[PDB]
Amino acid sequence: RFGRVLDAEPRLSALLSDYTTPAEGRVALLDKALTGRPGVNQTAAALLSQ
């Protein structure tokens, strides 16, 4: 589900892709966008954050 979500809205994919920016910022962006909601499984959320 997260893979198909990130396939759409390639701007979000590019923002997450940039590793020049600090990793914490990308993780926070992902949490606010994808994994910060109750529907995300704990293991899947941890894998996405990593």
């Binding site: 809205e9 701007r11 979000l12 923002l15 920016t21 910022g25 926070a28 962006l29 606010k32 966008a33 994808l34």
Partner: protein, 36 residues
Amino acid sequence: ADIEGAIEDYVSSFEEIGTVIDAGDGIAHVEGLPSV
């Protein structure tokens, strides 16, 4: 979707000076300067 709003919010925190990284024989490579 709410992803756009989160991206915009993150963008709020996500002179212009570069630094020479390689130099010699009349050529200098400059890191930085995104707007050169």
